[PDB]
Amino acid sequence: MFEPFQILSICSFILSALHFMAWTIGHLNQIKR
Amino acid sequence: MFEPFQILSICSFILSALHFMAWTIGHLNQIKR
Amino acid sequence: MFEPFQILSICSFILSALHFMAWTIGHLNQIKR
Amino acid sequence: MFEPFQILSICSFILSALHFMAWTIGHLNQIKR
Known part of the structure; x- marks a missing residue:
């Protein structure tokens, strides 16, 4: 966590x-199985 | 505000x-309450 | 352009x-004027 | 790869x-050719 940009x-x-x-x-809408 | 990347x-x-x-x-479209 | 992150x-x-x-x-679809 | 932010x-x-x-x-949906 040395670099603040990590957040x-x-x-x-x-x-x-x-x-x-x-x-x-x-996009899938229906699960379809 | 030391780091400019903050902006x-x-x-x-x-x-x-x-x-x-x-x-x-x-996606919700109607408030639905 | 000193900071490379600028790009x-x-x-x-x-x-x-x-x-x-x-x-x-x-979302607007039609110009509507 | 000196800068870690590159990733x-x-x-x-x-x-x-x-x-x-x-x-x-x-948005195109059909290839249309």
């Missing part, structure tokens, strides 16, 4: 994974 | 919260 | 303005 | 190009 990196990473997560489900 | 961090954060804000409402 | 800041800024630009038009 | 820059760049890539196809 921005981790935050962006989390928001990035969650962004594609919701999007993927959105 | 980019704060800006992104604000734009991030506002991005999900509009999106959430968009 | 990432400027790029993100440009992509941010263009992102909301297309989105706004997308 | 975040490269990652964002890749995710940015892939984001617009899928979006463009999404």
Whole structure:
């Protein structure tokens, strides 16, 4: 945690994974199994 | 405000919260209460 | 241009303005005048 | 690779190009040729 910019990196990473997560489900709509 | 990169961090954060804000409402469409 | 991170800041800024630009038009659909 | 923030820059760049890539196809829907 020496670099303060780490907080921005981790935050962006989390928001990035969650962004594609919701999007993927959105486009998929139905679970389809 | 020692680090100049802070301006980019704060800006992104604000734009991030506002991005999900509009999106959430968009997907929700109706208030539903 | 002393800070190299500037390139990432400027790029993100440009992509941010263009992102909301297309989105706004997308949601608006019709020009409506 | 002297600057550690480079990893975040490269990652964002890749995710940015892939984001617009899928979006463009999404809006286009049909290939149209």
